[PDB]
Amino acid sequence: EMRLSKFFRDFILQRKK
């Protein structure tokens, strides 16, 4: 199943934080 991916990478991609 999936849940966190679009949003996860939507931010994870950002090193900061």
Solving technique for this entry?
A: NMR
Residue carrying the six token digits 């199943």 = 1
CA–CA separation, 16 vs 11, rounded Å?
A: 9
**Structure tokens belonging to residue 17:** 């934080």
Cα 8 from Cα 2, distance rounded (Å): 11
What type of residue sits at position 2?
M
User: Which letter does DSSP use for residue 13 in this model?
Assistant: T
Question: 14: which 2 tokens?
Answer: 């950002």
3-16 burial, b for 16+ CB within 10 Å, e for fewer? Answer: eeeeeeeeeeeeee
